[PDB]
Amino acid sequence: SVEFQVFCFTNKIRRLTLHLELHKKDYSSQRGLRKTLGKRQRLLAYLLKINGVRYKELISKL
Amino acid sequence: MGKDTIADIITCIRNADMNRKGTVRIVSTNITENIVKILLREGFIENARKHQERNKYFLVLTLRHRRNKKGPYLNTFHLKRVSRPGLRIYSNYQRIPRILGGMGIAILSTSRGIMTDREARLEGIGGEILCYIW
Amino acid sequence: MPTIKQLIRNTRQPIRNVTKSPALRGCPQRRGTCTRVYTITPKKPNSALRKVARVRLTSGFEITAYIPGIGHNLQEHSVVLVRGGRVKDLPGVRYHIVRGTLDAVGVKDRQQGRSKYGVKKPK
Amino acid sequence: GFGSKSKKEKIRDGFEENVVQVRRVTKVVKGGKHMRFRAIVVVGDKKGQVGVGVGKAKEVVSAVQKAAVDARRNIITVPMTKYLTFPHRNEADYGAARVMLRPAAPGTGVIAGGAVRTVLEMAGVENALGKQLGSNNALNNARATIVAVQTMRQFSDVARDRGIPMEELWK
RNA sequence: GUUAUCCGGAAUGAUUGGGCGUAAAGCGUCUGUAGGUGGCUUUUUAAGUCCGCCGUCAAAUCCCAGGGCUCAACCCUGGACAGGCGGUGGAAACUACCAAGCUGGAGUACGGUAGGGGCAGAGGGAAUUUCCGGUGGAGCGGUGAAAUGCGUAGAGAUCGGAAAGAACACCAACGGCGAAAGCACUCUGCUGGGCCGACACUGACACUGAGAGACGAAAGCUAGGGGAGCGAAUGGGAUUAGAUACCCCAGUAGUCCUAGCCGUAAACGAUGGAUACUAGGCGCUGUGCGUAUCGACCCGUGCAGUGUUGUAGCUAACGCGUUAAGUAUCCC
């Protein structure tokens, strides 16, 4: 299941970001946010590598 | 399952018999099957057996020995790769080498199949030299 | 240095055979003008009074050149012909002076190996 | 203590001897600084039978012959099939001296560095060419050739080992 | 003969052909773009690859074979392998491509699980110093030995009362976690990461990473707090020929915190990362299965991580050795 990985990582970045911006100095979870961004980004380049229209739907969903 | 499936088998051969263990377990892809098919019939090894463990067909390969010595195999096997991934080598039917005069063989990928120097020198075809053993 | 991309950028290159004579810079031996004909000492293990002529060259450099042989005629403002070759004992002397050539006479009374010192045959 | 060692020296027509270097190696003591002689002797008949040996003693000649008695218990035979040359090329390092040996045409006298050439001109091979890659040493050099010509196989024993009956050989 | 220039030797710029623990050399560690390399099966095109044929790469040179100068040098006649590029006809194993599946690589979902992972908030008690009281009266403190200091204005010692900042004894282990730096008084909150199982899911989504970005002990600096101890500089005493020093007594910046900058360390495992394979013994940590009881044990084990001796192999040696400095592949 791929779109649950992208969507799940998106909610991960939402909850972790609204953690981090009202907190502002945790330099440990910064790596977690950046590993999630990079991991999701290699997924988006993967599904963009496979398809057009379907990845256009992944952009249009979020 | 690393980068190479041929340094897979080959490095399992060198690491197999440099510790004198006369038994190899490797994956059985098409080109591994072809190499052990053109390698059991050339007297280097003894037997190759396919089987399965979790329905994954593998090759166990029995190496040669001799009798109770300081080391039970006298002639060290000396396997070597040539056409590395990222540096492909290619030869005509001129460059194709007689390894040590012929005591080694150079298994290589013709358009026919994969041959040895005997079976690609008579053909006159040439191709990508996988590796030569001696 | 992999075959891929650390080396089809470049390995590096060695510089040259570095010139063992920075003057003479065309080719082998070059006309000189004597400026000083002083005498200096070698490093610590040796002990001598080696007699060098600091010489201006026609190239554009000025350089202290050694004077071989025993006798020497070389006064102030004479003309010599320097050649390459490092005298080890003297710091700074890089060059020799040819003997028997222009305005630098051959050595006095030498009968072993004369072509290095510019002395014609006796007998 | 019978005397003069005439019968006991074994006149050495069977093994001809040469040094290849005699370096004076020295140790210091409380009294001072005293030296012994390390000689390296390569023994061998021209039949194909050589071996190195080191020795050291305060005399020169006892170090040479002492290295010889160490050497003439250390012999391999040279696999040299053809008209006094080599079956195939070989390379084998020992320590930090690497030696590439290469067979030659019969119109080629042995060309190698002094230690390698010494153990081959005593080995009775006539047609080889061996470059030395690595050390300036003489002992590990020569002993590296000895290891580089132990591991060398003819065509008859490779034909015997592989099981292939016979072809692919001009002679 | 000397000199100069060039190549060799020189594997001393390394594709053939080197290295990076300690010899010169692994970025401090990590994320990731470009780019490089990449699992298995089946099918398609042939760009690479290979084979045939054809065109051309002037002549001279070099190579072979003849011939001519009395030979040679040199001249001449004929021939051609390489190898380059192009046209064209074939092959499909490998790289690439087209399409379709696959799961062990990688993830996710789920259930557990361990932790000084991080940050924030609360709370804690020894100890030290200072102050305030009661006592008592001559030294206390310090040293190799002394002295400066403090002390009759009552020191130190002892008991009580406050206040202050900073650090957190035993537990502490050749232990756990983090990418490294680092992280230990306890509790709470938010939150990272790891490990293990079932097929529960997708189907190669992988590795590395130029430039880039982040973090990055300590000392340092800007701004504001705070300041007990310790303590560069400084000052005094001592030792000393001399002492700007080691010793001692005071002692400022600093040490701590807020917000930044700085971006270096023996940032060390003196060892970049990743995958696959190659004896064992003795351990520790986390989980999983079976035995044993039915419950804690306890034995073997499946893995992951951490350590100590050690076979093979490598190494100049010392040593390293499944967490390689082994065998190979990739990337910087």
UniProtKB/Swiss-Prot annotation, chain A:
Q: What is its main location?
A: plastid
UniProtKB keywords:
Chloroplast, Plastid, Ribonucleoprotein, Ribosomal protein
Assembly, per entry: Component of the chloroplast small ribosomal subunit (SSU). Mature 70S chloroplast ribosomes of higher plants consist of a small (30S) and a large (50S) subunit. The 30S small subunit contains 1 molecule of ribosomal RNA (16S rRNA) and 24 different proteins. The 50S large subunit contains 3 rRNA molecules (23S, 5S and 4.5S rRNA) and 33 different proteins.
GO terms under biological process? translation
Tell me which species this is from.
Spinacia oleracea (Spinach)
**Domain of life assignment:** Eukaryota
The identity of this protein, by name, is Small ribosomal subunit protein uS15c
Described purpose of this protein according to its UniProt entry = Component of the chloroplast ribosome (chloro-ribosome), a dedicated translation machinery responsible for the synthesis of chloroplast genome-encoded proteins, including proteins of the transcription and translation machinery and components of the photosynthetic apparatus.
Of the GO CC terms on this record, one is:
ribonucleoprotein complex
> What family does this chain come from, according to its entry?
Belongs to the universal ribosomal protein uS15 family.
Output the Gene Ontology terms for molecular function: structural constituent of ribosome
Q: Which gene encodes it?
A: rps15
Q: Where in the cell is it found?
A: Plastid, Chloroplast
Disulfide pairings:
none
UniProtKB/Swiss-Prot annotation, chain B:
InterPro entries linked to this entry: Ribosomal_uS8, Ribosomal_uS8_CS, Ribosomal_uS8_sf
SUPFAM superfamilies according to UniProt: Ribosomal protein S8 (SSF56047)
Gene Ontology MF, one: rRNA binding
The entry sums up its family as follows:
Belongs to the universal ribosomal protein uS8 family.
> Its quaternary structure?
Component of the chloroplast small ribosomal subunit (SSU). Mature 70S chloroplast ribosomes of higher plants consist of a small (30S) and a large (50S) subunit. The 30S small subunit contains 1 molecule of ribosomal RNA (16S rRNA) and 24 different proteins. The 50S large subunit contains 3 rRNA molecules (23S, 5S and 4.5S rRNA) and 33 different proteins.
Q: Which residues form a coiled coil?
A: none
Q: What is this protein called?
A: Small ribosomal subunit protein uS8c
Q: Which GO terms describe its biological process?
A: translation
- Where located? Plastid, Chloroplast
- Check the record and name the PROSITE patterns matching this protein: RIBOSOMAL_S8
Q: Which NCBIfam families match?
A: PRK00136.1
Q: What keywords does the record list, in alphabetical order?
A: Chloroplast, Plastid, Ribonucleoprotein, Ribosomal protein, RNA-binding, rRNA-binding
Superkingdom in the source lineage: Eukaryota
Which Gene Ontology CC terms are recorded?
Answer: chloroplast; ribonucleoprotein complex; ribosome
Say which species the protein is native to. Answer: Spinacia oleracea
**Described purpose of this protein according to its UniProt entry:** Component of the chloroplast ribosome (chloro-ribosome), a dedicated translation machinery responsible for the synthesis of chloroplast genome-encoded proteins, including proteins of the transcription and translation machinery and components of the photosynthetic apparatus.
From Swiss-Prot, chain C:
Write one Gene Ontology MF term: rRNA binding
InterPro entries (alphabetical)? NA-bd_OB-fold, Ribosomal_uS12, Ribosomal_uS12_bac
Q: Name one GO biological process term.
A: translation
Q: Where is this protein localized, as stated in its record?
A: Plastid, Chloroplast
The UniProt keyword set, sorted, is: Chloroplast, Plastid, Ribonucleoprotein, Ribosomal protein, RNA-binding, rRNA-binding
| Source taxon at top rank | Eukaryota
Q: One Pfam family name from the record?
A: Ribosom_S12_S23
Q: Which family does it belong to?
A: Belongs to the universal ribosomal protein uS12 family.
Task: Give the miscellaneous note.
Answer: Exons 2 and 3 are cis-spliced, while a trans-splicing reaction is required to link exons 1 and 2.
* Functional summary from the UniProt entry: Component of the chloroplast ribosome (chloro-ribosome), a dedicated translation machinery responsible for the synthesis of chloroplast genome-encoded proteins, including proteins of the transcription and translation machinery and components of the photosynthetic apparatus.
Q: What is this protein called?
A: Small ribosomal subunit protein uS12cz/uS12cy
Q: What is the species of this protein? A: Spinacia oleracea (Spinach)
Curated annotation (Swiss-Prot), chain D:
| GO biological process entries | response to antibiotic; translation
| Record carries keyword DNA-binding | no
Protein's cellular compartments? Plastid, Chloroplast
Boundaries of each S5 DRBM domain copy?
Answer: 15-78
- Keyword check for Transit peptide, yes or no: yes
* Molecular-function GO terms, alphabetical: mRNA binding; rRNA binding; structural constituent of ribosome
Q: Which GO terms describe its cellular component?
A: chloroplast; mitochondrial small ribosomal subunit
Name the UniProt key words of this record, in alphabetical order.
Antibiotic resistance, Chloroplast, Plastid, Ribonucleoprotein, Ribosomal protein, RNA-binding, rRNA-binding, Transit peptide
Q: How does it assemble?
A: Component of the chloroplast small ribosomal subunit (SSU). Mature 70S chloroplast ribosomes of higher plants consist of a small (30S) and a large (50S) subunit. The 30S small subunit contains 1 molecule of ribosomal RNA (16S rRNA) and 24 different proteins. The 50S large subunit contains 3 rRNA molecules (23S, 5S and 4.5S rRNA) and 33 different proteins. uS5c binds directly to 16S ribosomal RNA.
Regarding protein family, the annotation reads: Belongs to the universal ribosomal protein uS5 family.
UniProt function note: Component of the chloroplast ribosome (chloro-ribosome), a dedicated translation machinery responsible for the synthesis of chloroplast genome-encoded proteins, including proteins of the transcription and translation machinery and components of the photosynthetic apparatus.
UniProt-recorded name of the protein: Small ribosomal subunit protein uS5c
What is the originating organism of this protein? Spinacia oleracea
Gene label: rps5
Q: Which residues of the full protein are shown?
A: 138 to 308 of 308
